[PDB]
Amino acid sequence: EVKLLESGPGLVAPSESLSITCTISGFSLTDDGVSWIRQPPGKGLEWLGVIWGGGSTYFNSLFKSRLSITRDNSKSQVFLEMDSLQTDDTAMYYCAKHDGHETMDYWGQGTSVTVSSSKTTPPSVYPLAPGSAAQTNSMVTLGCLVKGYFPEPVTVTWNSGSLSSGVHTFPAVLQSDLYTLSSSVTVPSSTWPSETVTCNVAHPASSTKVDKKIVPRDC
Amino acid sequence: NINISCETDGYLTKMTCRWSTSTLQLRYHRSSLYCSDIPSIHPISEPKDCYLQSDGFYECIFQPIFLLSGYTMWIRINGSLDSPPTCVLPDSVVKPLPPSSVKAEITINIGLLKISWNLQFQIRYGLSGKEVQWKMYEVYDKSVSLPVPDLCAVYAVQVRCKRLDGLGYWSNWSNPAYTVV
Amino acid sequence: IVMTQSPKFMSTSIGDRVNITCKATQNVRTAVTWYQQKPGQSPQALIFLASNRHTGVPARFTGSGSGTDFTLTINNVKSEDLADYFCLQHWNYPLTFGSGTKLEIKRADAAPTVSIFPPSSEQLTSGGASVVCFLNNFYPKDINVKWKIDGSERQNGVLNSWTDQDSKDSTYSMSSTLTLTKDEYERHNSYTCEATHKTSTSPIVKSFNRNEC
Ligand code: NA
Fold first, then answer.
1. What is the CATH superfamily name and number for domain A1-117?
2. Rounded to 5 degrees, what are φ and ψ at C117?
3. Where is this motif: WSXWS motif (chain B)?
């Protein structure tokens, strides 16, 4: 199946450069084009440029003074470079495949890019165990509090993604130039604490991966 | 003004296009689907390398080929002018490979020439002679059995094929097979 | 070339039909693609070349139009259709996208499921104390949360965050976090989260008492 996956830096300081790699599979870069598009917070999508199957490159006039798009066919990678970033270059950045010269058929996952003179800060990950395991409707809720990180994002899973349907992960908030978010998971009371529950938190900008088991409070 | 004609190889690995007669550059626009009722110049295109051959034609190779994508092509001529565009669906300009392992057998007790090797076929056979005198037979089916004036003569046999629906090119004639009895 | 989508938001109900339009400032023939973008996800193609379905897109999505006027129609709306929908023209450079129309889905009123959590040991070791209240799977979006410490209302140090509408049941959820110093947390006893929502005249109240082994 066609897949595109961006790898970028998370954070760029003002006036420095952004480099992103888009690794593709399930097609060849020499048969179709790959574009870069960005989505700034709360704004419309903006096409940055394309590198066509035969290798010609077209850029949006707004960015041609500072973009490069290149590739390495042998490694199935397409590379973006943008120079001299400023605050308003903060955005989610995507690569996307073209189907001939008439549409884009698949998009990447996107990689978040924040432009700021603040420094990368990993989160504290705090397990949230209730006052007791006492049930409501044969259920119990646990959680996870992920506090004081920069830049966005963090991602959270539970039991390595085995627990997904009773989960709510909330958008992050700003609490003193750092982000905080939480996540709740609701499970049958017969399964906790009798079976282990663990929130798994990633903050890629800091290369952080942390697991925190939820431990009951009896003495 | 400039005619571009194209043919897809029988292995379905490429399409080869040719044209003949300022600086000149073949451009193409590939559709996610087919060819519209009326071909047109499109703002989004790419160039192709074409090379002048000894017959006076430029030849350009599209490899690999998207068989079911409509390729609209034209010549950009340097201000700039575009020749009238044409659109081709590569699967429709295939030239199939010839039938292979052609066998030609006369069985005496049966009294027929048996030849063996979605498509239609033409068969041609004649006395193995000089410039052979060819009779031709058409099949719309694997193997056919024809009468011959002389069960002891040696015949030469060739088969070629084309899409049963009549689109595309005929194959070359297969390498001649010779009867044995 | 500017692709204008005038509706920023449109509200529908499960099983209804919705029209999303895009108008180009120039003739883009049929080179228009519609995308769906669900919350926290990448765009995915619905319709390309104005009216053709991308692989796997159910028949209840259709597209029409050519020239400058284009429409995506979503028949028989379902919960998973909760998303942003926007167009692309792919006729000339720069390639340009419409700014999007967010689809919102009406449903029946639903009371929140409330749960309260004391600070972790790990947090208390670090010198901080956050108390968290989850208010899950409710409708509509408007909701009031009050925190009380030993019966007296506190609003300083409270941060609230709402999800988007759920893709399965179209509800909202919300987290509310009250952040204290360890020292202030340790000087009080009773912590309460009180939710008031249109579904009842009485607030939902959850509480705990600070307790150590
Ligand atoms: Na239990």
1. Immunoglobulins (2.60.40.10)
2. -135, 125
3. 170-174
**Claim to verify: residue C94 and residue C4 sit in the same structural domain:** yes
Whether residue B124 lies within 8 A of chain A, CB to CB, comes out as no
Is the peptide bond prior to C119 cis by the omega test (within 30 degrees of 0)?
A: no
Select from C48, C49, C92 the Cβ nearest to the Cβ of B44. Answer: C92
> Which residue does chain B place closest to C32, by CA atoms?
B32
Chain B residue numbers touching C48 (CB-CB < 8 A)? 32
- Three-class secondary structure of residue A2 per DSSP: coil
Method: X-ray
Tell me the shortest Cα–Cα distance from B48 to chain C, in angstroms.
20
Fold held by A118-216: Immunoglobulin-like (2.60.40)
Contact B32 A54 (CB under 8 A): no
Measured between alpha carbons, how far is C89 from C50 in angstroms, rounded to an integer? 10
Distance of CA A35 to the CA centre of its chain: 19
β-partners of residue B133 are none
Hunting for tokens 């189907």 — which residue is that?
Answer: A99
Evaluate the CA torsion angle C47, C52, C57, C60 in order and state its sign. Answer: positive
Edge to edge, the sheet with strand C113-117 lists C113-117, C128-138, C172-181, C158-162
Give the residue carrying structure tokens 């004649």.
Answer: B126
DSSP string of B27-88, one letter each residue: EEEE-SS---SS----SS-EEE-EEE-TTS-EEEEE-S--TTS-EEEEEEE---EEPPPEEE
Beta strand segments in A14-64, E: 18-25, 34-39, 46-51, 57-59
Whether the bond into A40 is cis, omega within 30 of 0:
no
DSSP state for residue A103 in the 8-state scheme: -
Q: Cα(first)–Cα(last) distance of chain C, in Å?
A: 68
CB-CB under 8 Å, B32 with C92:
no
Of A56, A102, A103, the CB nearest to B46: A56
Dist. CA C189 → ligand 1 center (Å): 25
Q: In chain B, whose CA is at the least distance from the CA of A30? A: B64
Q: Which amino acid is at B146?
A: L
**Closest-CA residue in chain C for B40?**
C29
What residue ranges define each of the domains in chain B, with the CATH number in brackets?
1-94 (2.60.40.10), 95-181 (2.60.40.10)
Q: Does B152 touch chain C (CB under 8 A)?
A: no
CA nearest C132: which of A51, B28, A214, B88?
A: A214
Cβ–Cβ of C49/B32 closer than 8 Å? yes
Question: Token match 């051959």: residue?
Answer: B53
